[PDB]
Design a protein around this ligand. Structure first.
Ligand code: HEM
Ligand code: HEM
Ligand code: HEM
Ligand code: HEM
Ligand code: HEM
Ligand code: HEM
Ligand code: HEM
Ligand code: HEM
Ligand code: HEM
Ligand code: HEM
Ligand code: HEM
Ligand code: HEM
Ligand code: HEM
Ligand code: HEM
Ligand SMILES: [Zn+2]
Ligand SMILES: [Zn+2]
Ligand SMILES: [Zn+2]
Ligand SMILES: [Zn+2]
Ligand SMILES: [Zn+2]
Ligand SMILES: [Zn+2]
Ligand SMILES: [Zn+2]
Ligand SMILES: [Zn+2]
Ligand SMILES: [Zn+2]
Ligand SMILES: [Zn+2]
Ligand SMILES: [Zn+2]
Ligand SMILES: [Zn+2]
Ligand SMILES: [Zn+2]
Ligand SMILES: [Zn+2]
Ligand SMILES: [Zn+2]
Ligand SMILES: [Zn+2]
Ligand SMILES: [Zn+2]
Ligand SMILES: [Zn+2]
Ligand SMILES: [Zn+2]
Ligand SMILES: [Zn+2]
Ligand SMILES: [Zn+2]
Ligand SMILES: [Zn+2]
Ligand SMILES: [Zn+2]
Ligand SMILES: [Zn+2]
Ligand SMILES: [Zn+2]
Ligand SMILES: [Zn+2]
Ligand SMILES: [Zn+2]
Ligand SMILES: [Zn+2]
Ligand SMILES: [Zn+2]
Ligand SMILES: [Zn+2]
Lengths: 106, 9, 106, 106, 106, 106, 106, 106, 106, 106, 9, 9, 106, 106, 106
């Protein structure tokens, strides 16, 4: 999957979590998000193609995904415990991280 | 699991 | 496992390594430590609950575990070579990382 | 494998990639590089053997391999798509990362 | 996944296949489509909720997915041979089946 | 297992679902029913032994099992979501399919 | 495998079954037939290459393989019980299905 | 599975063994029996619910299943050698153990 | 793990079960207890080192662990059914078995 | 393997352990002993072929193997820790158990 | 899963 | 599962 | 498979390789050839039935298969690099080896 | 295993095959023989300790095992077809090969 | 890998074995050597490009690798027993075989 595909996966599964009424659906969606973020971590976005791999921008970009992966993990930990509403709240909070990276590099 | 899998696999 | 459980796992297995007299015991203990650190890295500690996810404090917190995971790997590499005393010495060095995070965040 | 072994593997496989005429050869070589870089990530180089793990130096050393691993991942993504020339170009770009670390720590 | 989620999966991956330039991408997308169809075939769509399970409408509905699964296999067979353009042409034919069921039941 | 054995499995697990008070027990029972139906699909019942494999009766017979497998899948989808009462209701509705085939071919 | 390859496999293994004196040989042959028929299920034969997938013709063609697969399953069930003569008789009965499709579509 | 379910499994499969004419059927049935006994051994039967876990009655109860599991293994050993009649004779002996526990605790 | 390590595992996971608010945490803890008891079963405690393997004391010692394993199984059966409070009550009752063996052999 | 075969395996591997100079050899030998003893556990010896399975005699016979299996486990634990001399001493201690059963039942 | 397994396995 | 695994594994 | 059946497998897959237009198809055919030749290696052909295993003829017969297996490996290596025409040419050269053995022993 | 131990394995399993009354038993014994011979193939016997790896004797020694391995395969093929007596006769013929090597190198 | 790359693998791992101070390191190196030699076995070297597969030279070339593979196995057996120095000496003796082939065909 390319960066855009991984973003579609992220966006789609966030919506799935929002509408979900059971732990299994939340777990599955978060698992897909984790895999999408893991694939996207190594990518170079269009607006940073001219930048050095060792640039503050590229460091910050990759950092965003590991921030996101960590938060996905915390959400899944809650979902695995059957705590649907708490995992949904945690998934809602992911958006801050989505937005922050977008504001800079999308 | 994700960080771990990123290297091992 | 919650943060406290993972800390208990880290502590118990670090003690197992000290008293160990064979490579297999050291390897088992280090393996258990890596799994506990893998779970703990995405947690939010009580003293940082009111902090932003992108705060210097939470950056530093996550970073401490990544440092720990790195050091566990160095110890594992030695244990896999059957070098019990060297692996044990490497495990003692882990404690600097344990101490540093506790001093700030425990 | 020790640090020198892993460096030999990285160097050998960069050469294999450069001369390759098929995706299978490129994919195999990049996989071996990924494994070597992952193993080197937790190593301590001769020039930093007295240094703090929490030192600017060991931080930076580890960071170099994490950077390299990300770049190998990106090249691997291309090789998996059968894109020989593109994956070879991505492998060529790795050299800046190789060189940066050598300048400081070799 | 609910029916809507599976439809999103079908749609997204059919678009991935169109824009694809390699066999692996086409194969991945088709694999994801087959799994979505496997889940969806046993669902009851909103417009057929008040219909009998042995109704001509539900027979036809289930049959549409089996047809789709068959066609995905023909496309997979081609992608497995590395025939990107032929697999893509086979995937376009899938749309007739998509259209037919939608015309009646969506 | 022969046809009679598979029927015993179907009958037994239907009762298990009825008396169940948890999702795990419902899931396990439905999983066993699916496997029993899958094994029974290819069988020839005594009252159709004289019939052609391509006969309307043999078509209708095999069709009943795939109807049953689909309904089992829908029930399990509900059970996997922790929706015990809904899965139990879905399992109750299976009886129509059991009865229909029996009335004709048992 | 292409359509002709799969037909060769079906024909060869029918002969192996006929001459077999042991269950292992019969089971192995029937397994290869199952695989071949499963692959042929999604193929389009030369005489229907211009036809609609939703046509009476392609419907019927696919149905023929589904029928054959069911019959192979039944024979396989017998071979797994070590019943050589009975499994050979079941294999012999397959020929009517082979022939029916050939008459229409070969 | 509850105690009653496991007893149904034991009973059904013991009957499958009696009527069996092949080793595979006998082996399958015995395998299912061993799994049911593995589940049942730790249960507390209705007539022993008010008894201490270390009572002679509960000791004897658990012991009955271990005896049964042992005998299933002897029957499995014979079925694995293809000795249908001997395995069947061994399975009939199982009934003494069934009877003994029932006489006391059912 | 040695006897003392296995005891630490038993003690730690009993506390985990007590504080748990979800089935997954209870399941995981009981699974670890089962593995610890299984490893400890074959051990010789300090106070029985002078005793014969065939002694009433060594028989009684090994018996305690199988008593414990059985009770852990019953607790896990409840936890697998999502019955958290009942599994926690069952885990509480384990202490009688812990205490009995300790009073004699610790 | 039959009873005599398993006894041959036990005897042969005791000799291998005695002459061994490395942990791998000791571990391998003990693993083969474990397998042999596990298989012999459900066997009926010539001198008890007329006896009740619930008899003091068959009880005691089975108990002897359960005892032996426990002792092999303990020796295996040591071999896994690379403790050659200690594992050899544990293997030597097995002989009392071997002999006890032979005296009664050989 | 059942239809899929019916062919593959 | 535990008793079973104790022998088999 | 008997010798004749392995030969049918060799012959059919040689034809598949000749008509192939992709690497996957060639790889698949060569893999099946390798398996058939490996089985045939230990067979005794009708014309050498009264001959000793250590006879000049039986040495020569086995060598023929080792020769063929080596060439199939060489062709497989080429197919795995996606070199379709080169792999086809290597397969064509196998015929010398097929023919040489036939002249002597078929 | 050392050479002597592999020989004990060969010898014991030859006796098992002789006394066997079923295919499973013969198959099991032949499988163990194949493994023992495969290990022994690269060993240097005491009587050839001062000899070169490329010596006429060491070529002959290794050939003896390749000879035996080929015959074990032939016997295994027969056992896998349930041909007990034929497999036993093939095993009996192995003795020529055992004896020939012993005369030279034992 | 091509022949040159397999040779690089042989050469590098011979150096690793020479400098090794533990069994794991020697085992790892020998395992990689075995794989490289196995691949090289079916290669045709530049200097024998116009030669027949059945030529005296190509027989000799393939034999060289079989020779090397046998010695690597012998060394591996020693490494697996933790006999580091003995395994190193066996690896050193490989050089005779390396050199002999080079003199003729490199
Ligand atoms: C769960 C959180 C996130 C969501 C829901 C999300 C969603 C999206 C969506 C819907 C798009 C548009 C895709 C398209 O053009 O078709 C997009 C684009 C993009 N996102 Fe994200 N995203 C998330 C996290 C992140 C993070 C953490 C980063 C940076 C570290 C990031 C970087 C980007 C970039 C660079 C693009 C532009 C891709 C391109 O134009 O090629 N996203 N995102
Ligand atoms: C937090 C997640 C991780 C966990 C739980 C983990 C755990 C482990 C363990 C237990 C081993 C020892 C394997 C054995 O010998 O039995 C190991 C080996 C290893 N790990 Fe990790 N690890 C993690 C992350 C990583 C990362 C991020 C990397 C790469 C930077 C890495 C690289 C390696 C390498 C190179 C080895 C040796 C070769 C191998 O067994 O793969 N690990 N890891
Ligand atoms: C191997 C090294 C480590 C050891 C041996 C260790 C050990 C412990 C122990 C025994 C506790 C007390 C747990 C309890 O309340 O029962 C604890 C608590 C804690 N540790 Fe660690 N730890 C290690 C690494 C770390 C690291 C790297 C961090 C931060 C990056 C950290 C952060 C904390 C925090 C925040 C607490 C408080 C937990 C709470 O009150 O909820 N520890 N640690
Ligand atoms: C793919 C990129 C790389 C290549 C091709 C490469 C290659 C090499 C080579 C051929 C050597 C000489 C080995 C020897 O002395 O035997 C070496 C040494 C070394 N490399 Fe790299 N390297 C790469 C990446 C890196 C990175 C990213 C770092 C730091 C993060 C690094 C750190 C070192 C160090 C510290 C040495 C000295 C080792 C010693 O003297 O023991 N290398 N490298
Ligand atoms: C690969 C071919 C197909 C594609 C690309 C596709 C795509 C879609 C899309 C994008 C939607 C809208 C989902 C939404 O509400 O967000 C949809 C809805 C729907 N589709 Fe499909 N579909 C395909 C095959 C089928 C088939 C074969 C059937 C029937 C046998 C079917 C029946 C339906 C139904 C009943 C809905 C309404 C869902 C609802 O409102 O709950 N689709 N489809
Ligand atoms: C969950 C639904 C079903 C249940 C609970 C069920 C139950 C049973 C039971 C208890 C028997 C008697 C077995 C015996 O004689 O020992 C039986 C027989 C039979 N059933 Fe079903 N069944 C179900 C579905 C079906 C379906 C869908 C079909 C046809 C497609 C079918 C066809 C038959 C036939 C042909 C027999 C007679 C077997 C014989 O006499 O050899 N059943 N069933
Ligand atoms: C086990 C039963 C079957 C056997 C033994 C069998 C055998 C054969 C054979 C030997 C051929 C000639 C292949 C060639 O021209 O190279 C063939 C062709 C063909 N078969 Fe079958 N077949 C069987 C089942 C079926 C079924 C069930 C169908 C349809 C549903 C079918 C459809 C065809 C078609 C369309 C051709 C012509 C292929 C072409 O000309 O490209 N076959 N079959
Ligand atoms: C293979 C041998 C066995 C067979 C065939 C068998 C069969 C049965 C059957 C058919 C039932 C009636 C279940 C129902 O209510 O629907 C039952 C009940 C029962 N059996 Fe067994 N059983 C066997 C072994 C054992 C053993 C070894 C024990 C004790 C160690 C035992 C203890 C019980 C108990 C306590 C009940 C009453 C269950 C309840 O009312 O909750 N059984 N058995
Ligand atoms: C869940 C139940 C159990 C719990 C919570 C438990 C807990 C403990 C603890 C905390 C210790 C002290 C460990 C130390 O010295 O560091 C211990 C020691 C010991 N326990 Fe247990 N135990 C349990 C079950 C059993 C059982 C069933 C037996 C006997 C069959 C047993 C036999 C022993 C022995 C012999 C020691 C002394 C070990 C030594 O000094 O080397 N325990 N136990
Ligand atoms: C590691 C300990 C043991 C060793 C080394 C050992 C060794 C042997 C040997 C060499 C034989 C002669 C086999 C033959 O006649 O061909 C034998 C026979 C026998 N052993 Fe053991 N044994 C051990 C443990 C046991 C145990 C624990 C039991 C009882 C629980 C037992 C019961 C028997 C019986 C009943 C025979 C007579 C078999 C017959 O005549 O068919 N053995 N044993
Ligand atoms: C709805 C359930 C099914 C799913 C999700 C599914 C999925 C797939 C996928 C993803 C592949 C590609 C494997 C790869 O190359 O990685 C495949 C291959 C294949 N499928 Fe299916 N399939 C299903 C049902 C069936 C059925 C019912 C048949 C038989 C009529 C079948 C026959 C085959 C055959 C012959 C292949 C090629 C060989 C193989 O990989 O097994 N499939 N399937
Ligand atoms: C890829 C190369 C080969 C091909 C295409 C091939 C093809 C064939 C074919 C079609 C048959 C007739 C089978 C039948 O009766 O139906 C046959 C028979 C035979 N082949 Fe081959 N073969 C090959 C390699 C070899 C080799 C290398 C040997 C000797 C080492 C060999 C030895 C024999 C023997 C002895 C028979 C007679 C079998 C019998 O009558 O029972 N073949 N071969
Ligand atoms: C199935 C056939 C074979 C059987 C039954 C067999 C059996 C035996 C036995 C029982 C021993 C005595 C081991 C001891 O000292 O305890 C032995 C030794 C020996 N065998 Fe074999 N053997 C067979 C095949 C071979 C072959 C094919 C070769 C040569 C290629 C061979 C070479 C040797 C050597 C060199 C020894 C002496 C080992 C030493 O003294 O260290 N054997 N064999
Ligand atoms: C462990 C023992 C061996 C070692 C250390 C070794 C090492 C090497 C090295 C370093 C090269 C140069 C590769 C290059 O051009 O970069 C080479 C080339 C070569 N070796 Fe070996 N080798 C060994 C075994 C063998 C054997 C046993 C044979 C023959 C059976 C052989 C045949 C060749 C040939 C034909 C070349 C030339 C490749 C070419 O020019 O394309 N080698 N070897
Ligand atoms: Zn991707
Ligand atoms: Zn950087
Ligand atoms: Zn956790
Ligand atoms: Zn603890
Ligand atoms: Zn941040
Ligand atoms: Zn390493
Ligand atoms: Zn190199
Ligand atoms: Zn740091
Ligand atoms: Zn779903
Ligand atoms: Zn989408
Ligand atoms: Zn219907
Ligand atoms: Zn069945
Ligand atoms: Zn039909
Ligand atoms: Zn195909
Ligand atoms: Zn053919
Ligand atoms: Zn249609
Ligand atoms: Zn249960
Ligand atoms: Zn029943
Ligand atoms: Zn008790
Ligand atoms: Zn332990
Ligand atoms: Zn005792
Ligand atoms: Zn046995
Ligand atoms: Zn022996
Ligand atoms: Zn008893
Ligand atoms: Zn064969
Ligand atoms: Zn010979
Ligand atoms: Zn060995
Ligand atoms: Zn030689
Ligand atoms: Zn290669
Ligand atoms: Zn030759």
């Amino acid at each position: 999957a390319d960066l855009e595909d991984n973003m579609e996966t992220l966006n789609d599964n966030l919506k799935v979590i929002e509408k979900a009424d059971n732990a299994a659906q939340v777990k599955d969606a978060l698992t897909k998000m984790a895999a999408a973020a893991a694939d996207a971590w190594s990518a170079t976005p269009p607006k940073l193609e001219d930048k050095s791999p060792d640039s503050p921008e590229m460091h910050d970009f990759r950092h965003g995904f590991w921030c996101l992966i960590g938060q996905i993990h915390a959400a899944l930990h809650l979902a695995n415990e059957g705590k649907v509403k708490e995992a949904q709240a945690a998934a809602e909070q992911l958006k801050t991280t989505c937005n922050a990276c977008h504001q800079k590099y999308r | 699991k994700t960080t771990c899998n990123a290297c091992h696999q």
